[PDB]
């Protein structure tokens, strides 16, 4: 008992050496995430350029949309497979295992590989998110300054690695709260005690968010406007949407994990067949990035359109099915990019589809289709990655509609419930469990 008394009067006393270093972590992470975010936008801008210069002859621009995206893809697939295998896919599970001290943090390799490799894939128009890169890069950035200044201890090592990935998430969504919550719900060891200073996480999370605020202010990622409020006699509709998401989540997990195996056979582990395969996929998303931009890309461009209900009931189903295919194909192929963002784009489409049904069935509720989208925006995350608390806050920090707080929680929970009862698994813990077992075998 006396241990606790001694512990209580010493709580929240993180050494100054850690707190100051966390600041320079988030600083670098932000700048890197800023530079990364601009690079893709630049590489996307140039692919857009050659299309105008070759506006005539339909099969020409379709071809040059393929190649430029295919080449950039292969440029990324190779940068990974040669110098840093660990920087393939998201990187979140890699950082997760790194906090459990079950995986290494080779920053000298990860930092240049994940960055430029991300530039190639993301810039090609592939269906990936800035998360994966920024999350892993951030952790390595924080690990880098740990090695350089030669700090010592379990606390100093686990903290700077946490703040690094935290600042990476924030600078990828301008959502500071979403980053910090992600560490204490998904990233930190969910089974044993750790010496992670939440206070230090804040500092790093702030600086990167500040760094993002410096170069992108007054221009939000997603603007949806103020959506209608939600009555109490409507909440039961949001529970159903959760249940639907609750049984589709695990299925998506089977697909994202299964496709990683099926696509693996195509190359068998060979660097050349793999790269060539990525050129087909990378070239595909660039081709689709012309004939149907809704079926490719991060998916952030369709959310405000979908939530506004500007899409049709048929178009949504098309967009949904098509994106599901391209989402798997891109991420499951081991390409350096986040699955975090495209799952935000999926549910927004699925939720809107649910809304347009609820609108015509129950006209008495005076329903706006968009509310089911914002509720269903982070409804796949609460099913796949199994971190509902981080999902809601993140969505809240990008949609700015707190008036739908109870719908968002109900759906996200009715989802997370069924995603347990239907035998689902945390897609980030599952991937880590896959590698950690493939190592001792």
> Out of its own copies, Cl ion, none, which partner does residue 232 contact, by CB within 5 to 8 A per kind?
its own copies
User: CA 107 to CA 136: how far, in whole Å?
Assistant: 9
User: CA 107 to CA 112: how far, in whole Å?
Assistant: 8
Query: Interface with Cl ion by CB under 5 A: which range of 86-94, 228-236, 241-249, 359-367?
Result: 86-94
On the CB side of 137, how many CA atoms lie within 13 Å of its CA?
Answer: 36
Residue 8, both tokens: 């209580």
Q: How far is the CB of 309 from its own copies (least distance, A)?
A: 24
The residue (of 307 and 429) whose beta carbon lies closer to Cl ion is: 429
Binder of Cl ion out of 340, 383, 388, 398 (CB under 5 A): 340
The residue (of 136 and 352) whose beta carbon lies closer to Cl ion is: 136
Residue nearest to Cl ion (CB): 89
Binding interface with its own copies (CB under 8 A):
1-2, 4-5, 7-9, 11-14, 16, 19, 100, 102, 176-177, 180-181, 184-185, 190-193, 198-199, 202-203, 205-206, 209-210, 213-214, 217, 232, 235, 386, 388-389, 392-393, 396-397, 400, 402-403, 405-406, 409-410, 412-413, 416-417, 420-421, 425-426, 429-430, 432-433, 436-437, 439-440
Q: How far is the CB of 220 from Cl ion (least distance, A)?
A: 21
The residue (of 185 and 308) whose beta carbon lies closer to its own copies is: 185
Q: Is 340 annotated as a binding residue?
A: yes
Q: How far is the CB of 430 from its own copies (least distance, A)?
A: 7
Residue 240, both tokens: 């159903």
Nearest to 139 by CA among 72, 81, 86: 86
Q: How far is the CB of 63 from Cl ion (least distance, A)?
A: 31
Q: How far is the CB of 94 from Cl ion (least distance, A)?
A: 7
- The answer to the question of residue 299 lying near Cl ion (CB under 5 A) is no
Residue 314, both tokens: 């048929």
Give the contact letters, 377-416, x = binds to Cl ion (CB under 5 A), - = no: ----------------------------------------
The residue (of 315 and 430) whose beta carbon lies closer to its own copies is: 430
Residues 6+ apart with CB under 8 A from 245: 347, 350, 376, 379, 380, 382, 383, 411, 414, 415, 418, 419
CA distances from 250 to 258, 365, 380 (A): 12, 32, 10
- Give how far the C-alpha of residue 152 lies from the chain's centroid of Cα atoms, to the nearest Å: 31
| Terminal alpha carbon distance of the chain | 44
- The answer to the question of residue 159 lying near Cl ion (CB under 5 A) is no
- How many residues touch Cl ion under the rule CB under 5 A: the total is 9
Place of tokens 């500007």: 310
Give me the sign of the Cα torsion angle 76, 78, 82, 87. positive
Nearest to 144 by CA among 169, 114, 122, 121: 114
> Out of Cl ion, its own copies, none, which partner does residue 19 contact, by CB within 5 to 8 A per kind?
its own copies
Radius of gyration of the chain (CA): 21
> Out of its own copies, Cl ion, none, which partner does residue 251 contact, by CB within 5 to 8 A per kind?
none
Cβ 127 vs Cβ 323: under 8 Å: yes
- Annotated binding residues for chloride, as ranges? 90, 339-340, 428
């Amino acid at each position: 008992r006396r241990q606790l008394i001694r512990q209580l009067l010493e709580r929240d006393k993180t050494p100054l050496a850690i707190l100051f270093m966390a600041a320079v972590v988030g600083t670098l992470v932000g700048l890197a995430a800023v530079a990364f975010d601009k690079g893709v936008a630049w590489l996307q801008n140039q692919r857009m350029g050659a299309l105008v210069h070759t506006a005539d002859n339909y099969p020409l621009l379709l071809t040059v949309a393929f190649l430029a995206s295919a080449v950039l893809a292969m440029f990324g697939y190779f940068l990974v497979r040669k110098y840093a295998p660990e920087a393939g896919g998201s990187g979140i599970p890699e950082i997760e295992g790194a906090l459990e001290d079950q995986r290494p943090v080779r920053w000298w390799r990860v930092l240049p590989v994940k960055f430029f490799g991300g530039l190639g894939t993301l810039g090609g128009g592939m269906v990936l998110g800035r998360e994966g890169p920024t999350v892993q890069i951030g952790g390595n950035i924080g690990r880098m300054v740990l090695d350089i200044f030669r700090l010592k201890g379990d606390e100093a090592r686990h903290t700077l690695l946490a703040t690094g990935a935290a600042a990476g998430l924030a600078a990828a969504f301008n959502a500071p709260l979403a980053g910090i919550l992600f560490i204490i719900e998904e990233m930190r060891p969910q089974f044993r005690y750790t010496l992670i200073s939440i206070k230090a996480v804040f500092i790093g999370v702030i600086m990167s968010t500040i760094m993002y605020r410096i170069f992108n202010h007054e221009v939000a990622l997603i603007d949806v406007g103020k959506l209608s409020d939600a009555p109490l006699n409507t909440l039961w509709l949001y529970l159903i949407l959760g249940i639907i998401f609750g049984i589709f989540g695990p299925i998506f997990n089977k697909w994202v994990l299964g496709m990683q195996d099926l696509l693996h056979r195509v190359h068998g582990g060979n660097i050349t067949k793999w790269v060539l395969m990525g050129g087909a996929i990378g070239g595909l998303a660039g081709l689709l990035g012309f004939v149907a931009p809704a079926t490719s890309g991060g998916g952030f461009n369709l959310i405000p359109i979908a939530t506004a209900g500007n899409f049709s009931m048929g178009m949504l189903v098309f967009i949904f099915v098509a994106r599901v295919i391209t989402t798997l194909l891109s991420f499951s192929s081991g390409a350096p990019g986040g699955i975090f963002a495209p799952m935000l784009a999926l549910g927004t489409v699925l939720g809107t589809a649910f809304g347009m049904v609820a609108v015509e069935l129950f006209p008495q509720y005076h329903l706006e289709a968009g509310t089911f989208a914002i509720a269903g925006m982070g409804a796949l995350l609460c099913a796949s990655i199994r971190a509902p608390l981080t999902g809601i806050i993140l969505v809240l920090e990008m949609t700015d509609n707190y008036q739908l707080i109870l719908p968002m929680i109900i759906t996200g929970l009715g989802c997370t419930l069924l995603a347990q009862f239907t035998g689902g698994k945390p897609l980030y813990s599952a991937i880590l469990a896959r590698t950690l077992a493939k190592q001792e075998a």
